[PDB]
Amino acid sequence: SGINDGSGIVLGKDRDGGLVLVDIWKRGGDRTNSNWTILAKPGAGKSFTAKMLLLREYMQGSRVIIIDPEREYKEMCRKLGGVWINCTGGEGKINPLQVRLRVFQSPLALHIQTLRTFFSLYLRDLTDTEKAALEDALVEVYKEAGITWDTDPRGVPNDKWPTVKELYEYCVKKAEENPETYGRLSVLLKRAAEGADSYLWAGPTAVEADSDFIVFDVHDLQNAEDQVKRAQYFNVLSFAWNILERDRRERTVLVVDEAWMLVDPQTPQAIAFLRDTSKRIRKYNGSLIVISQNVIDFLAPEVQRYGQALLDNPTYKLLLAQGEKDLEAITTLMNLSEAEHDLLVNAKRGEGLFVAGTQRIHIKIEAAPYEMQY
Amino acid sequence: WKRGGDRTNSNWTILAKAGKSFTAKMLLLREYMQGIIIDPEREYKEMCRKLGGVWINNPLQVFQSPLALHIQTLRTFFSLYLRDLTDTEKAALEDALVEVYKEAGITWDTDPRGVPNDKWPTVKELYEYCVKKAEENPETYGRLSVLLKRAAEGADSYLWAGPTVFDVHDLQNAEDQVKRAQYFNVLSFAWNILERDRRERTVLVVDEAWMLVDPQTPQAIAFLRDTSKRIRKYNGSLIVISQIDFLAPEVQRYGQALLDLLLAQLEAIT
Numbered sequence: 001s002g003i004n005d006g007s008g009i010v011l012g013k014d015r016d017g018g019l020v021l022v023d024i025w026k027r028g029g030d031r032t033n034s035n036w037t038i039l040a041k042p043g044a045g046k047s048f049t050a051k052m053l054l055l056r057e058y059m060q061g062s063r064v065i066i067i068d069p070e071r072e073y074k075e076m077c078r079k080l081g082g083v084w085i086n087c088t089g090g091e092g093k094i095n096p097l098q099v100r101l102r103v104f105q106s107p108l109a110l111h112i113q114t115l116r117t118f119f120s121l122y123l124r125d126l127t128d129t130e131k132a133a134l135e136d137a138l139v140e141v142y143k144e145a146g147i148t149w150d151t152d153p154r155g156v157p158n159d160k161w162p163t164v165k166e167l168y169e170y171c172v173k174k175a176e177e178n179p180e181t182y183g184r185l186s187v188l189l190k191r192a193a194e195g196a197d198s199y200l201w202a203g204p205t206a207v208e209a210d211s212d213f214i215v216f217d218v219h220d221l222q223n224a225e226d227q228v229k230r231a232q233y234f235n236v237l238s239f240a241w242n243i244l245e246r247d248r249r250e251r252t253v254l255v256v257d258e259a260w261m262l263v264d265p266q267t268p269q270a271i272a273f274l275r276d277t278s279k280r281i282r283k284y285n286g287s288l289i290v291i292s293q294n295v296i297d298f299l300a301p302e303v304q305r306y307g308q309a310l311l312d313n314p315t316y317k318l319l320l321a322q323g324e325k326d327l328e329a330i331t332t333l334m335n336l337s338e339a340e341h342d343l344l345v346n347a348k349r350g351e352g353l354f355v356a357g358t359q360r361i362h363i364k365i366e367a368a369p370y371e372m373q374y
Numbered sequence: 375w376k377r378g379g380d381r382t383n384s385n386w387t388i389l390a391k392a393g394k395s396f397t398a399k400m401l402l403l404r405e406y407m408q409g410i411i412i413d414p415e416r417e418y419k420e421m422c423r424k425l426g427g428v429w430i431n432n433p434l435q436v437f438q439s440p441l442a443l444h445i446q447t448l449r450t451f452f453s454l455y456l457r458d459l460t461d462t463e464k465a466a467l468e469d470a471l472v473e474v475y476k477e478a479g480i481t482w483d484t485d486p487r488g489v490p491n492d493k494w495p496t497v498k499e500l501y502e503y504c505v506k507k508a509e510e511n512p513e514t515y516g517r518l519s520v521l522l523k524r525a526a527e528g529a530d531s532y533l534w535a536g537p538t539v540f541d542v543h544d545l546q547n548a549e550d551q552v553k554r555a556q557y558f559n560v561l562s563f564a565w566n567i568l569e570r571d572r573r574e575r576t577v578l579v580v581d582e583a584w585m586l587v588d589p590q591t592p593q594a595i596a597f598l599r600d601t602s603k604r605i606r607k608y609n610g611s612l613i614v615i616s617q618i619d620f621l622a623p624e625v626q627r628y629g630q631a632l633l634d635l636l637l638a639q640l641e642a643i644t
């Protein structure tokens with residue numbers, strides 16, 4: 001039906017053949033944030049459209065950060081000289097116990113809660129006594145490394161942080177006097193310290209991640225256990241978010257792809273973390289783009305308080321062809337008309353509904369031939 | 375004392391502007407003759423003595439870790455006493471608790487049934503701990519120490535800084551946070567009495583309960599409701615007597631379940 005801001009980027013075409021031109025940095029009326037939700041079944045053109053939009057923003061000066069479970073952004077990253085991070089290779093190790101930047105608030109306390117979320121995703125049946133023994137072992141393992149409550153993360157070198165190894169070893173030592181509080185905790189933690197999952201976390205953060213185009217590839221976890229997927233994705237999202245605070249460049253775009261992977265009904269704090277990120281990022285004048293299939297996953301009773309805001313709050317939305325369950329979930333959530341329902345029903349590749357504030361239109365996405373090399 | 379049908383619990387709620395203390399004490403002597411009161415107004419001192427029972431005028435005294443949950447009740451006692459505590463300061467305090475305990479040689483796996491009231495650490499050692507921590511962590515510990523001073527070796531230290539009708543009246547004109555705090559503590563110690571000796575059919579009166587209402591720490595109230603549900607689980611009776619404080623938006627979730635005899639009043643209870 002037509003959406004043309006004076007300037008910005010061209011996203012695709014009208015139903016009448018007119019260019020849809022959108023400036024996602026606008027503020028005013030129904031443009032309250034710069035955030036996107038991109039929802040569709042596999043193969044509908046989600047990653048492609050994202051790549052086109054990111055390319056066009058990057059060209060204008062946006063730094064771009066991407067979490068990439070499908071390995072869809074590697075090539076584009078090469079073409080732009082970006083930093084490509086192999087989060088499963090030793091060279092891409094991201095230490096979860098590396099405290100992340102935030103009247104006065106203790107960086108350490110903040111990061112201990114983050115870890116509650118992190119260790120709940122990875123260890124799913126942790127009792128309340130273990131939770132707090134773990135939070136205690138955490139602070140203690142920090143102390144022994146010379147980091148304390150006032151300590152400023154910005155000044156600490158990557159290798160001074162403790163790892164899950166020290167945490168696991170402290171838990172074993174404690175198990176002696178406390179076999180019942182720590183016993184089962186220590187053993188579960190071994191897997192991450194020395195065992196099958198240690199390649200991910202048992203060492204210092206390997207990378208700086210200073211570039212205007214970063215991608216965290218987590219592709220090598222596609223066949224790993226769910227809890228490993230989820231715990232690594234959350235660690236990576238937390239590391240990635242820290243980059244915006246660490247050096248608050250404006251118009252940064254943070255892209256979390258296949259975001260459904262983060263959903264854990266028993267630990268909705270991970271999606272809350274995502275929800276909070278979309279809120280905070282407005283302050284830094286950036287953009288959170290959430291890309292996903294499996295929409296209903298967000299809308300589950302345990303996570304829906306969080307998921308629902310995550311997906312419906314963003315000023316810009318792109319809905320392409322949907323899975324049957326997902327389409328009914330979306331039609332209800334975003335009050336799609338009947339026309340808008342059917343549009344997405346027979347929607348062809350790269351075609352669907354584009355939302356900007358309260359403006360919703362039929363759109364067909366298409367990239368210029370000179371861009372295709374990306 | 376009944377059960378079944380419409381008789382689910384043995385709780386009471388006496389509300390009014392009216393003689394709730396009279397009525398309460400009479401029926402108390404009454405249920406008694408067939409055989410634990412928090413009294414901030416000395417309304418049972420004389421009666422308690424006429425019964426010749428016992429009248430008396432350490433919060434740090436404590437699979438599931440006895441320590442790990444006494445740590446939570448503790449975080450409430452402390453939110454009540456220190457009103458402007460930051461999340462960081464709260465966490466700092468909690469950790470301090472754990473460490474002060476470790477130095478007293480009590481851990482996560484320790485049976486609290488084996489520690490003399492003397493072996494427990496007190497608020498003094500928590501203060502000394504924090505003062506020490508505050509040298510390297512002033513941002514996180516400085517104010518927490520400056521604030522714990524009056525409770526360790528200052529104007530409140532008499533209340534807690536030693537190894538441990540419950541008369542509260544001596545704090546009737548103190549700061550409301552202090553009185554709210556002690557009320558909370560005594561309430562803890564009493565509930566402990568009645569979760570240590572399962573002498574059934576016990577009544578625990580909470581006189582003027584609104585004193586334990588802090589819109590910013592509705593936890594003390596949550597604890598009230600908890601005690602009210604638990605006591606049934608030990609075949610007993612909680613009695614809350616009070617003169618809207620319980621129905622306020624931030625406490626109501628607790629105070630509605632809690633508050634559900636009516637004397638002179640009103641609009642809210644109608």
Ligand SMILES: Nc1ncnc2c1ncn2[C@@H]1O[C@H](COP(=O)(O)OP(=O)(O)O)[C@@H](O)[C@H]1O
Binds near residue numbers: 040042047049349366
């Ligand atoms: N608008 C488009 N024009 C041309 N090719 C497209 C378009 N959208 C997607 N494709 C291609 O079709 C395939 C599916 O798109 P993709 O974004 O990977 O799907 P998904 O929705 O699963 O992320 C990709 O190989 C991509 O190159």
Ligand SMILES: [Mg+2]
Binds near residue numbers: 046047072257258
């Ligand atoms: Mg995709």
